[PDB]
Design a protein around this ligand. Structure first.
Ligand SMILES: OC[C@H]1O[C@@](CO)(O[C@H]2O[C@H](CO)[C@@H](O)[C@H](O)[C@H]2O)[C@@H](O)[C@@H]1O
Ligand SMILES: [Cu+]
Lengths: 67, 67
């Protein structure tokens, strides 16, 4: 499944930060849309693991669903 | 009591808010964030190690500017 999250990013540095923590987690295929403040992820990790990883950044995060 | 200074690569207000949230979550800290100068000052008993690790959770590039 491809999980979609709303992540409050407001500059390229914000997106870069999200990319860095997801890479640290590893085993992820993702794309970040800055203007629409959305991050889509595909991985063997649980939704909870992904959510916690994103929330640890200090940014506002919410789960939108999956495709 | 110790007063630490860190360099944090923040590039927008949202970046600063995220740093604030991770420090608020850690607790036991008195901090000041200087966005334009990419500097975060922290007065805390928490070890330099703990503070560095906490700031790194933001996914931003962090370095130590000393006591
Ligand atoms: O610290 C490595 C970590 O940084 C990220 C954050 O987006 O990527 C940036 O740094 C890379 C250098 O290794 C650049 O190639 C890349 O373009 C840049 O965004 C993570 O992707 C990477 O794991
Ligand atoms: Cu930002």
């Amino acid at each position: 499944p491809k999980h979609e999250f709303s992540v409050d990013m407001t500059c390229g540095g914000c997106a870069e930060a999200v990319s860095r923590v997801l890479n640290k987690l590893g085993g992820v295929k993702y794309d970040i849309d800055l203007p629409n403040k959305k991050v889509c992820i595909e991985s063997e990790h649980s939704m909870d693991t992904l959510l916690a990883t994103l929330k640890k950044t200090g940014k506002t995060v919410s789960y939108l669903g999956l495709e």
